[PDB]
Structure formats: structure tokens, C-alpha cells
Curated annotation (Swiss-Prot), chain B:
The mushroom-shaped unit cells of the Sulfolobales' S-layers may consist of three SlaB subunits and six SlaA subunits. It comes from Sulfolobus acidocaldarius (strain ATCC 33909 / DSM 639 / JCM 8929 / NBRC 15157 / NCIMB 11770). This is S-layer protein A. It is found in: Secreted, Cell wall, S-layer. The chain holds residues 103 to 153 of 1424 of the full protein. Belongs to the Sulfolobales SlaA family. The gene is slaA. S-layer large protein. May form the highly ordered outer sheath. The lineage of its organism: Archaea, Thermoproteota, Thermoprotei, Sulfolobales, Sulfolobaceae.
Amino acid sequence: PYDETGAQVTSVSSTPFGSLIDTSTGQQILGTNPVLTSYNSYTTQANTNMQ
Amino acid sequence: RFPTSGYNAYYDSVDKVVFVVVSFLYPYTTTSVNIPLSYLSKYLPGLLTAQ
């Protein structure tokens, strides 16, 4: 599979969730946004707060 | 007026404004000083996302 700069890379580099840019703000998402911590603790988070 | 040679000019693409810093009061009046990004980010949050 191709990558940026037209180079074929043998391994995939994941795009970090925290590096995504908000559409309604124009800025990268924070490190303390609730969904990020929810993803980082999904087991306990969904077990406790049922969200 | 700002000079056309030796001047400083900056542009923020998130706050999408052209800004320039000028030193007036003591001590820095005629001597250039370095303005940290984190403290200038207080008056312009966009500098935190896009340099």
C-alpha cells in the first residue's frame, strides 16, 4: 500500500486519536477530552458509568 | 510605520490573523526580546495548534 510522498511503506503508522483536528473548532482535540479518556479506560469506564 | 526591511511579521492560520509584537516599556525598548509561545497563546489560542 502507498503512503504519503508517493512512497510504498511496508508497515502502517496509526494516526493518533489525539492528533485529529476538530471540524467545528479548527484545532487538534485536547488530551483531556472525555471520549479520549473513555477510550483509554473503556473497560472500567463502561463497567462503572454505563456510558 | 513598520519597516520594509528588518521588520517582523507573523501570521496565525487558526486564529487566522496577522500579528506583530512590539516592545515599548522598560527594559526592552530598542532591544529585541524572545516571546514564548505558551504565554502569547493566552491572547491567541490558535498558536497552540498551528505554529
